Enzyme design. Structure first.
Site, PDB file in Angstrom:
ATOM      1  N   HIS A  12      86.073  80.566  29.609  1.00  0.00           N
ATOM      2  CA  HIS A  12      85.336  81.798  29.989  1.00  0.00           C
ATOM      3  C   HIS A  12      84.479  81.659  31.264  1.00  0.00           C
ATOM      4  O   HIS A  12      83.266  81.461  31.246  1.00  0.00           O
ATOM      5  CB  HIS A  12      84.417  82.303  28.865  1.00  0.00           C
ATOM      6  CG  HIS A  12      84.023  83.772  29.060  1.00  0.00           C
ATOM      7  ND1 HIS A  12      84.390  84.753  28.227  1.00  0.00           N
ATOM      8  CD2 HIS A  12      83.318  84.354  30.111  1.00  0.00           C
ATOM      9  CE1 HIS A  12      83.941  85.917  28.717  1.00  0.00           C
ATOM     10  NE2 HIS A  12      83.285  85.691  29.910  1.00  0.00           N
ATOM     11  N   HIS A  14      84.823  83.639  35.391  1.00  0.00           N
ATOM     12  CA  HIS A  14      85.583  84.578  36.235  1.00  0.00           C
ATOM     13  C   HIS A  14      85.733  84.070  37.676  1.00  0.00           C
ATOM     14  O   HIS A  14      84.732  83.755  38.301  1.00  0.00           O
ATOM     15  CB  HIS A  14      84.897  85.947  36.319  1.00  0.00           C
ATOM     16  CG  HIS A  14      84.659  86.651  34.981  1.00  0.00           C
ATOM     17  ND1 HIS A  14      85.196  87.841  34.628  1.00  0.00           N
ATOM     18  CD2 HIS A  14      83.777  86.272  33.970  1.00  0.00           C
ATOM     19  CE1 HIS A  14      84.676  88.213  33.450  1.00  0.00           C
ATOM     20  NE2 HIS A  14      83.791  87.246  33.028  1.00  0.00           N
ATOM     21  N   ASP A  16      86.424  85.511  40.608  1.00  0.00           N
ATOM     22  CA  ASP A  16      85.576  86.384  41.422  1.00  0.00           C
ATOM     23  C   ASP A  16      84.071  86.437  41.104  1.00  0.00           C
ATOM     24  O   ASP A  16      83.247  86.975  41.825  1.00  0.00           O
ATOM     25  CB  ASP A  16      86.205  87.764  41.430  1.00  0.00           C
ATOM     26  CG  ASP A  16      86.286  88.398  40.042  1.00  0.00           C
ATOM     27  OD1 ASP A  16      86.467  89.609  40.012  1.00  0.00           O
ATOM     28  OD2 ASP A  16      86.162  87.733  39.011  1.00  0.00           O
ATOM     29  N   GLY A 181      84.891  94.129  31.533  1.00  0.00           N
ATOM     30  CA  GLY A 181      83.908  95.067  32.079  1.00  0.00           C
ATOM     31  C   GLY A 181      83.505  96.270  31.227  1.00  0.00           C
ATOM     32  O   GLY A 181      84.294  97.191  31.062  1.00  0.00           O
ATOM     33  N   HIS A 211      86.430  90.612  25.802  1.00  0.00           N
ATOM     34  CA  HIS A 211      84.959  90.590  25.836  1.00  0.00           C
ATOM     35  C   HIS A 211      83.994  90.996  24.704  1.00  0.00           C
ATOM     36  O   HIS A 211      83.097  90.243  24.475  1.00  0.00           O
ATOM     37  CB  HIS A 211      84.386  91.089  27.154  1.00  0.00           C
ATOM     38  CG  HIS A 211      84.468  90.066  28.249  1.00  0.00           C
ATOM     39  ND1 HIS A 211      85.620  89.633  28.705  1.00  0.00           N
ATOM     40  CD2 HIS A 211      83.462  89.507  29.040  1.00  0.00           C
ATOM     41  CE1 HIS A 211      85.396  88.820  29.773  1.00  0.00           C
ATOM     42  NE2 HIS A 211      84.039  88.717  30.004  1.00  0.00           N
ATOM     43  N   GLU A 214      78.894  90.771  23.808  1.00  0.00           N
ATOM     44  CA  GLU A 214      77.728  90.474  24.674  1.00  0.00           C
ATOM     45  C   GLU A 214      76.695  91.603  24.772  1.00  0.00           C
ATOM     46  O   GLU A 214      75.510  91.385  24.705  1.00  0.00           O
ATOM     47  CB  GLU A 214      78.277  90.138  26.043  1.00  0.00           C
ATOM     48  CG  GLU A 214      77.346  90.182  27.249  1.00  0.00           C
ATOM     49  CD  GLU A 214      78.226  90.047  28.472  1.00  0.00           C
ATOM     50  OE1 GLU A 214      79.172  90.806  28.588  1.00  0.00           O
ATOM     51  OE2 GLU A 214      77.974  89.180  29.307  1.00  0.00           O
ATOM     52  N   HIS A 235      82.025  85.868  24.508  1.00  0.00           N
ATOM     53  CA  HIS A 235      80.663  86.016  23.972  1.00  0.00           C
ATOM     54  C   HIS A 235      80.566  86.254  22.469  1.00  0.00           C
ATOM     55  O   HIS A 235      80.182  85.381  21.703  1.00  0.00           O
ATOM     56  CB  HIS A 235      79.763  87.094  24.583  1.00  0.00           C
ATOM     57  CG  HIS A 235      79.697  87.011  26.094  1.00  0.00           C
ATOM     58  ND1 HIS A 235      78.689  86.435  26.779  1.00  0.00           N
ATOM     59  CD2 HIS A 235      80.613  87.524  27.006  1.00  0.00           C
ATOM     60  CE1 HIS A 235      78.925  86.551  28.091  1.00  0.00           C
ATOM     61  NE2 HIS A 235      80.097  87.224  28.199  1.00  0.00           N
ATOM     62  N   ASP A 292      80.587  81.638  32.770  1.00  0.00           N
ATOM     63  CA  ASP A 292      80.795  83.031  33.119  1.00  0.00           C
ATOM     64  C   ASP A 292      80.985  83.405  34.589  1.00  0.00           C
ATOM     65  O   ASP A 292      82.060  83.833  34.987  1.00  0.00           O
ATOM     66  CB  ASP A 292      79.714  83.847  32.457  1.00  0.00           C
ATOM     67  CG  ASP A 292      80.159  85.190  31.989  1.00  0.00           C
ATOM     68  OD1 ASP A 292      79.326  85.849  31.389  1.00  0.00           O
ATOM     69  OD2 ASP A 292      81.306  85.568  32.226  1.00  0.00           O
ATOM     70  N   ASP A 293      79.895  83.285  35.368  1.00  0.00           N
ATOM     71  CA  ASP A 293      79.906  83.648  36.812  1.00  0.00           C
ATOM     72  C   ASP A 293      78.893  82.845  37.639  1.00  0.00           C
ATOM     73  O   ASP A 293      77.765  83.290  37.837  1.00  0.00           O
ATOM     74  CB  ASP A 293      79.484  85.107  37.050  1.00  0.00           C
ATOM     75  CG  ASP A 293      80.258  86.117  36.236  1.00  0.00           C
ATOM     76  OD1 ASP A 293      81.183  86.703  36.779  1.00  0.00           O
ATOM     77  OD2 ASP A 293      79.915  86.334  35.077  1.00  0.00           O
TER      78      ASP A 293
END
Ligand SMILES: C[C@H](O)[C@@H](CCOc1ccc2ccccc2c1)n1cnc(C(N)=O)c1
Ligand SMILES: [Zn+2]
Length: 349
Positions: A12, A14, A16, A181, A211, A214, A235, A292-293
């Site tokens: 998990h 991303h 981008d 998203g 997803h 979360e 999550h 995550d990011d």
């Protein structure tokens, strides 16, 4: 420093959300983008959060930096390649990476994202590149890497093209579908485009993650499980607000994709509260630790690990345990999970 200086698995993250700031500048300054600024330190500091924000305030970040990469072939290639690299500097030995290819595309994609103009980069083409990048980055960096393609919740129209990409490019590098998203749009787990997508996935043997949980209610988690038939939850923290669902998910060995640092930064966890992960650990759940990011969260995997180590009492044996769960719950073929896991065990002793 390092909280857990051993082999890790991560499931998990991303693509981008995992771009070097310096290569965002490279590409804006290249393509003519315009960007919150023009030095890497600045740059990180503005797409960095360090504070929960509204959803608006959070999606606008993707609005700045994505148009520097989306639509550019050398860029798609390069971020995939640089990511593998990032993760090797984390000590990961297997990562799944996810992303939406429609959100790197600028042609046969409607609506075209990021205010981009059209252009000749198609969703299919994006995944070709990405995985080119992952592969050679596998070759050079030593991390074993697969990818997960993401449907978006507000855009069920892409969902079957998502499915088909996964079938088209399966086992190199793509191993699964995700749904991403914005959880909060009403009924979106049950949008016919998503639910025909995940059913097609089941029909074709591709692995599922979603997803759910979360930011949405436990109802969204139960949607992921019962209607879309996920094998893992991204999550999942709200599943705690419904205990039969928690009880049954713990008992069908359901995997949770945890992201500790992601969740303070987003608001998904309120920091005055039992972090989901400590309960998850107290109950011996199947879970991973996850980034995550890192761009957005100013992170690395060690960041995540430092958090649970310093503030949640975790422990190297759990660290070992949870990474072993991650390997058992990966979307690898079993001959290769077992190869992953025998590496981990050896390393762990
Ligand atoms: C899935 C992709 O790899 C990508 C999508 C980027 O664009 C979006 C677009 C709309 C969204 C609405 C609500 C929440 C996240 C959104 C992310 N992405 C990157 N990180 C996230 C995240 N943390 O939710 C989603
Ligand atoms: Zn995510």
């Amino acid at each position: 420093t390092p909280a857990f200086d051993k082999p890790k698995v991560e499931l998990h993250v991303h693509l981008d959300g995992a771009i070097k700031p310096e290569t965002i500048l490279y590409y804006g300054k290249r393509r003519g983008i315009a960007l919150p600024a023009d030095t890497p330190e600045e740059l990180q500091n503005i797409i960095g959060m360090d504070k929960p924000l509204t959803l608006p305030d959070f999606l606008a970040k993707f609005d700045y930096y994505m148009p520097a990469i989306a639509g550019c072939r050398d860029a798609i290639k390069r971020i995939a390649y640089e990511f593998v690299e990032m993760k090797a500097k984390d000590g990961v030995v297997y990562v799944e990476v996810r992303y939406s290819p429609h959100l790197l595309a600028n042609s046969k994609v409607e609506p075209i994202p990021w205010n981009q103009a059209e252009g000749d980069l198609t969703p299919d083409e994006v995944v070709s590149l990405v995985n080119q990048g992952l592969q050679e980055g596998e070759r050079d960096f030593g991390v074993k890497v697969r990818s997960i393609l993401c449907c978006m919740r507000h855009q069920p129209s892409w969902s079957s093209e998502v499915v088909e990409l996964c079938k088209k490019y399966r086992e190199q590098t793509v191993v699964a579908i995700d749904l991403a998203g914005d959880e909060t749009i009403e009924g979106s787990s049950l949008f016919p485009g998503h639910v025909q997508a995940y059913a097609e996935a089941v029909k074709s043997g591709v692995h599922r993650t979603v997803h759910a949980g979360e930011v949405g209610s436990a109802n969204v988690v139960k949607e992921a499980v019962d209607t879309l038939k996920t094998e893992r939850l991204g999550h999942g923290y709200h599943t705690l607000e419904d205990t039969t669902l928690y009880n049954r998910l713990r008992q069908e060995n359901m995997h949770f994709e945890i992201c500790p640092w992601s969740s303070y930064l987003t608001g998904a966890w309120k920091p005055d509260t039992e972090h989901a992960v400590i309960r998850f650990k107290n109950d011996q759940v199947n879970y991973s630790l996850n980034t995550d990011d890192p761009l957005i969260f100013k992170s690395t995997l060690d960041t995540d690990y430092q958090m649970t180590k310093k503030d949640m009492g975790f422990t190297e044996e759990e660290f070992k345990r949870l990474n072993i769960n991650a390997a058992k719950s990966s979307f690898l073929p079993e001959d290769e999970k077992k190869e992953l896991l025998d590496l981990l065990y050896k390393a762990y002793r």
